Amino acid sequence: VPARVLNSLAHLQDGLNIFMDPDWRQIRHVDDWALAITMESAELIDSYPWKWWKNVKAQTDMHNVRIEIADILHFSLSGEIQKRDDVALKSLKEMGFFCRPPADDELLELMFFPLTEVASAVATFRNIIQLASIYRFDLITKGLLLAAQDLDFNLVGYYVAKYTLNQIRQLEDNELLHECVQSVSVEDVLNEGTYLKAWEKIACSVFDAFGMPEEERRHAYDWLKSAAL
Amino acid sequence: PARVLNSLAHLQDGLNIFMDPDWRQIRHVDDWALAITMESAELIDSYPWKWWKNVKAQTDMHNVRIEIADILHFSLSGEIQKRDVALKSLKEMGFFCRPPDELLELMFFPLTEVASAVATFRNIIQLASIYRFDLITKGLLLAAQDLDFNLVGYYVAKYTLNQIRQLKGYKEGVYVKVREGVEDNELLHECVQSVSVEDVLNEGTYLKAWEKIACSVFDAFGMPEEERRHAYDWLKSAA
Numbered sequence A: 001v002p003a004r005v006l007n008s009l010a011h012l013q014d015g016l017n018i019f020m021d022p023d024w025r026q027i028r029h030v031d032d033w034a035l036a037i038t039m040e041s042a043e044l045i046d047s048y049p050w051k052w053w054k055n056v057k058a059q060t061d062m063h064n065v066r067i068e069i070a071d072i073l074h075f076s077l078s079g080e081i082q083k084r085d086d087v088a089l090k091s092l093k094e095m096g097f098f099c100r101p102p103a104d105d106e107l108l109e110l111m112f113f114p115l116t117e118v119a120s121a122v123a124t125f126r127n128i129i130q131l132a133s134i135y136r137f138d139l140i141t142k143g144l145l146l147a148a149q150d151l152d153f154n155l156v157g158y159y160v161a162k163y164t165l166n167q168i169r170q171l172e173d174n175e176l177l178h179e180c181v182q183s184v185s186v187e188d189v190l191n192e193g194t195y196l197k198a199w200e201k202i203a204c205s206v207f208d209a210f211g212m213p214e215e216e217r218r219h220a221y222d223w224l225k226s227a228a229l
Numbered sequence B: 001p002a003r004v005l006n007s008l009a010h011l012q013d014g015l016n017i018f019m020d021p022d023w024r025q026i027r028h029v030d031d032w033a034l035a036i037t038m039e040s041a042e043l044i045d046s047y048p049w050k051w052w053k054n055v056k057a058q059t060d061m062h063n064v065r066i067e068i069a070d071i072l073h074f075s076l077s078g079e080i081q082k083r084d085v086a087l088k089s090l091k092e093m094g095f096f097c098r099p100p101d102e103l104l105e106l107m108f109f110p111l112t113e114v115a116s117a118v119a120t121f122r123n124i125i126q127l128a129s130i131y132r133f134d135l136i137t138k139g140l141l142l143a144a145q146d147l148d149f150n151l152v153g154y155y156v157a158k159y160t161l162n163q164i165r166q167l168k169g170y171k172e173g174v175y176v177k178v179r180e181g182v183e184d185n186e187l188l189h190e191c192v193q194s195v196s197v198e199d200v201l202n203e204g205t206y207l208k209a210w211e212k213i214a215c216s217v218f219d220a221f222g223m224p225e226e227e228r229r230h231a232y233d234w235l236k237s238a239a
Ligand SMILES: O=c1ccn([C@H]2C[C@H](O)[C@@H](COP(=O)(O)OP(=O)(O)O)O2)c(=O)[nH]1
Pocket: A053, A054, B015, B016, B019, B069, B070, B071, B073, B074, B077, B158, B162, B185
């Protein structure tokens, strides 16, 4: 996943954040993001049957898991931006604090697959809670993208689709969104070079799909275009 | 107090044995770290922490009590299973947090405002992460005296509800939890408030007053005498 792409993603988030409160980056604090990443991580974990003593038989909600990975991605990028000392990660590692199932370089040994299995997920997403602990949003974004790759979940497709809907809502939905992501590939939306062509294809599939008359779009694609930096 | 605190950890042992007898063997220190992480998030969600939402509704403080009793259950558990400069270097790091002794440097009061609650239990999670259940327990008691509530009492009440639940299909997904509006735990208030704080902490009395609470909760759930035997027997042995 090319850095260029990672940067672009954050731009869009900044757009999203701006609409809700245009002074987010002054008012808002690095510690809020870390909080929100901690809660939605918990939220994700609660979709799995981790409680040894409660409905032990419960089937996992891998759908909700996917939509939670994205919910977290929003807060992560928001903290990434906002964060604009290092040997503090490896320090926690030797302290053996980060954890593992009882059975980028630097962040792979904290992720545990397949995410479809409970212990592997619990491990993984507690380790996001910890990366957050110490404000490492950048690795939580890279981690979230891994989670999704393991889950065969086209996360940045879905993030752009969902971004473009928010655009409409200023000027079952989920089912339509996932359908727009299809018109465009996984390899495509990440491939440095073609990616901004491909994100524009998704955007445009959303607008059509929802019914943004061609005529009200004169500026819809603007920030998206500016997201190339 | 002191034998009371021992007496608490013994009950915790019996509750966990009720769930799986070979628990110390099948459980793992990280199971308890997780457990505390989640009941800490469920406590924090109580509070209007979403800057992007309605802050106006009142924080349900009575609910907080019960989620504090629940964390306590988990740290007693943690402490039991687990058989300095680590911590102060983490403090240096920036690994703990603040709103905008080694223990009362990560608790922030009053627990009544969103912000101080958020730092406090964010740091309770951070603690559970390095498996310092010892400091969690103690912060929980510290927290009970800021909220001016009867932790030991609530612990015993929830302890006994935790049993009722298992006997009523909880592990199997078939328990009646909410009944016309009202959830499980809400029942636990009038129960513990039936006895005094003084009473639950006296080094002679106390086990009598805990047996009182136990019994109140069982009466709420209308239970036969035979199903109260695991709890009444662990409350005896607790001496
Ligand atoms: O091995 C265990 C597992 C759970 N609990 C107790 C602790 C706490 O009091 C409660 C948490 O259970 P819950 O299902 O999360 O209930 P609630 O929704 O009321 O918070 O269960 C134990 O004591 N021992």
